[PDB]
Amino acid sequence: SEPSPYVEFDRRQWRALRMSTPLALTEEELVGLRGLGEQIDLLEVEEVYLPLARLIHLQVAARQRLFAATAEFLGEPPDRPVPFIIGVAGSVAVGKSTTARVLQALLARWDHHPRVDLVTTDGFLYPNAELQRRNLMHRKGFPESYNRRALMRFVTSVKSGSDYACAPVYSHLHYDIIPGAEQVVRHPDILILEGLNVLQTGPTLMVSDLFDFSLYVDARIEDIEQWYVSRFLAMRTTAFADPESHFHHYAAFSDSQAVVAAREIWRTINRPNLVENILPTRPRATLVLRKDADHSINRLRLRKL
Amino acid sequence: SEPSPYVEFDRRQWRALRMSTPLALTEEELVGLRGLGEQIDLLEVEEVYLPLARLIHLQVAARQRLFAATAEFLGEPPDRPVPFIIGVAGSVAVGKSTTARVLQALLARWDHHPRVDLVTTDGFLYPNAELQRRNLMHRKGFPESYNRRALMRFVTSVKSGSDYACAPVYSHLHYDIIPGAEQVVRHPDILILEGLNVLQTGPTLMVSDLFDFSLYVDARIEDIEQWYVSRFLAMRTTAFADPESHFHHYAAFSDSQAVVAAREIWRTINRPNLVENILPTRPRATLVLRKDADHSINRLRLRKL
Numbered sequence: 001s002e003p004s005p006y007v008e009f010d011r012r013q014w015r016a017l018r019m020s021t022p023l024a025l026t027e028e029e030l031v032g033l034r035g036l037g038e039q040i041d042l043l044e045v046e047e048v049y050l051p052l053a054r055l056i057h058l059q060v061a062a063r064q065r066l067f068a069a070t071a072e073f074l075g076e077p078p079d080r081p082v083p084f085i086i087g088v089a090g091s092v093a094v095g096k097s098t099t100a101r102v103l104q105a106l107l108a109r110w111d112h113h114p115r116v117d118l119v120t121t122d123g124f125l126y127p128n129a130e131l132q133r134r135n136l137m138h139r140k141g142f143p144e145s146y147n148r149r150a151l152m153r154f155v156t157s158v159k160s161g162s163d164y165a166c167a168p169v170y171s172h173l174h175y176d177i178i179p180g181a182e183q184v185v186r187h188p189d190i191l192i193l194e195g196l197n198v199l200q201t202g203p204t205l206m207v208s209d210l211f212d213f214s215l216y217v218d219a220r221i222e223d224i225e226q227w228y229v230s231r232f233l234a235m236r237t238t239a240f241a242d243p244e245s246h247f248h249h250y251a252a253f254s255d256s257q258a259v260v261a262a263r264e265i266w267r268t269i270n271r272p273n274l275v276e277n278i279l280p281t282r283p284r285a286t287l288v289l290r291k292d293a294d295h296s297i298n299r300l301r302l303r304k305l
Numbered sequence: 306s307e308p309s310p311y312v313e314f315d316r317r318q319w320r321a322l323r324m325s326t327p328l329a330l331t332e333e334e335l336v337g338l339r340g341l342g343e344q345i346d347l348l349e350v351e352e353v354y355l356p357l358a359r360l361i362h363l364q365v366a367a368r369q370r371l372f373a374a375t376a377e378f379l380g381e382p383p384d385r386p387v388p389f390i391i392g393v394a395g396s397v398a399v400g401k402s403t404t405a406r407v408l409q410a411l412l413a414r415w416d417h418h419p420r421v422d423l424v425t426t427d428g429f430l431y432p433n434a435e436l437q438r439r440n441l442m443h444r445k446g447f448p449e450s451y452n453r454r455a456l457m458r459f460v461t462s463v464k465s466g467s468d469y470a471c472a473p474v475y476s477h478l479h480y481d482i483i484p485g486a487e488q489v490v491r492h493p494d495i496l497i498l499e500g501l502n503v504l505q506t507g508p509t510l511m512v513s514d515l516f517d518f519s520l521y522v523d524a525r526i527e528d529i530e531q532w533y534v535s536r537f538l539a540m541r542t543t544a545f546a547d548p549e550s551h552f553h554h555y556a557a558f559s560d561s562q563a564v565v566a567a568r569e570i571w572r573t574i575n576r577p578n579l580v581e582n583i584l585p586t587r588p589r590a591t592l593v594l595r596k597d598a599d600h601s602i603n604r605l606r607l608r609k610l
């Protein structure tokens with residue numbers, strides 16, 4: 001009685017689209033792809049990520065057909081397909097990075113055996129020096145803190161079938177970009193771009209306009225704040241514990257101080273960014289994975305149109 | 306030495322992509338599709354619109370393949386394809402409406418014989434009453450003067466394979482929407498949406514996100530002002546001449562007054578709208594037809610990626 005471009009699913013419903021897709025991941029390999037605080041088990045990989053993987057390959061061939069028509073039209077000469085670009089977006093601490101890692105492993109282990117790369121956009125973040133100069137240290141993560149010009153070049157270069165294309169490297173440990181570090185990407189079959197900012201749209205063409213498929217990992221804003229604070233507290237004995245950690249001073253905080261500090265940074269930087277720039281981007285993602293307070297994925301929204 | 310998602314053409318180059326596409330339009334039929342002030346001849350239809358028509362059908366099949374994958378995935382039941390939506394955008398008086406009419410006739414006369422409809426977005430303009438109430442009479446044509454909610458419904462409804470979907474009707478003569486008038490669209494093979502506003506992007510999903518192909522008819526902003534003023538002067542003896550014309554008072558203007566009036570409305574309403582909302586939309590169109598001062602199409606920009 002009122003059409004929608006979306007189709008909504010239940011884990012029970014989605015679970016059924018797996019068909020007879022092979023589970024090529026061990027419980028040992030899954031654990032190494034897992035992020036701090038993530039609750040993902042093989043059952044979810046089976047129940048949720050397998051159908052998603054199937055759907056994606058179905059479309060990788062169908063999309064390769066499209067560029068064929070434009071090629072047949074322009075009447076140009078291949079054997080090297082157009083890379084299939086996938087964008088993964090989500091809030092900080094919502095688990096998008098884990099989702100991206102699983103998705104890569106799952107896709108790379110497919111009969112025809114593709115070359116699946118994964119690049120995180122934080123490598124296109126301006127160096128801390130440039131941020132201070134632009135007065136954006138307090139806005140790290142916002143669309144302005146990234147070198148969107150460079151990011152666009154990279155993706156354009158890769159999808160154009162460039163032989164070699166490389167990107168800068170970000171160190172979460174040093175909270176800055178690594179001097180002289182490069183991530184090289186040579187003609188991949190599927191490139192996964194993961195970032196807070198990736199689904200952004202605008203006046204000029206943007207990276208989002210070059211995606212062939214996009215995932216938005218969603219959760220309740222109040223639940224993410226919890227995951228964030230939790231992770232923060234747990235990093236006192238892991239990352240912050242390292243002397244080279246930029247936030248080594250946090251390691252000594254007490255459960256009490258830590259929760260305060262964590263909440264401050266959240267409502268001050270991460271929350272505004274989520275509400276203002278990331279969330280407004282959800283409507284356009286191809287697939288939206290809605291997570292529950294327990295980190296469990298129980299609802300899925302697919303773009304049929 | 307720096308990739309781009311576009312490919313630029315010369316009329317000579319583009320002219321060559323026609324291959325052996327049949328010219329099924331008479332010089333008599335072309336004239337009836339022509340707009341006041343337009344200089345389009347069969348040569349241009351042959352030289353420019355024929356390759357474009359070929360390219361479009363190439364992609365209509367390739368795109369139908371894509372929805373097939375999503376269908377095979379969801380494992381649903383067809384014989385009635387997903388309508389192929391084409392958006393045509395451009396400034397007022399740039400000729401987009403003529404371009405749209407030619408494109409429709411050209412496409413509808415193709416071997417397999419498709420059902421090609423054409424809807425103009427001005428029918429989704431709020432009635433003059435609603436505009437006055439919202440204080441937008443001076444902003445007729447801007448994105449806010451349209452009922453984007455209704456427009457989105459319509460297109461969504463049609464692409465969903467709706468049996469019947471209908472739209473309101475706008476009268477250029479009465480400068481308002483016709484009471485009780487409906488344009489009915491029954492499961493078309495290709496729906497062409499033509500409007501100033503169609504390529505607009507935003508926070509939520511928009512009509513532009515549902516297009517499968519888009520044309521942007523471009524020209525020099527200074528040349529359009531000329532075409533506009535010219536047309537205005539010529540409408541004194543055509544449209545404005547009719548007693549029922551909302552702008553019947555303009556028919557009596559002298560060449561002098563008319564040019565003044567025309568220029569006022571231009572720099573006041575149409576130009577701002579062009580610069581502010583329409584032009585910023587060009588980068589995203591699939592095909593950009595650049596017209597020359599003589600109304601001739603001499604350059605084409607295609608989105609390869």
Ligand SMILES: CC(C)(COP(=O)(O)OP(=O)(O)OC[C@H]1O[C@@H](n2cnc3c(N)ncnc32)[C@H](O)[C@@H]1OP(=O)(O)O)[C@@H](O)C(=O)NCCC(=O)NCCSSCCO
Nearest residue numbers: 035036092093097098140141172173196232239247265269
């Ligand atoms: C730098 C930036 C923009 C990075 O955004 P991301 O999208 O990468 O954040 P996300 O939550 O997805 O983190 C991705 C990975 O990066 C890890 N990570 C994040 N921050 C740090 C860190 N400081 N040290 C070590 N690892 C970190 C995080 O644990 C994930 O690892 P795994 O999934 O393998 O377990 C963001 O963390 C930031 O700094 N935002 C504003 C300032 C801020 O939040 N400062 C607090 C610093 S201590 S708190 C925990 C990280 O926010």
Ligand SMILES: CC(C)(COP(=O)(O)OP(=O)(O)OC[C@H]1O[C@@H](n2cnc3c(N)ncnc32)[C@H](O)[C@@H]1OP(=O)(O)O)[C@@H](O)C(=O)NCCC(=O)NCCSSCCO
Nearest residue numbers: 340341397398402403445446477478501537544552570574
């Ligand atoms: C109503 C609106 C938004 C319509 O925008 P459109 O995109 O349809 O304009 P566009 O230039 O593409 O016109 C499309 C057709 O609509 C015709 N047309 C435009 N205005 C009128 C009119 N007032 N009376 C009769 N026909 C008209 C025009 O000649 C085209 O016909 P053909 O291609 O078959 O020869 C626009 O004309 C408008 O009113 N804009 C702001 C106010 C304004 O410009 N007022 C001046 C009124 S007299 S001047 C000539 C039309 O601007």
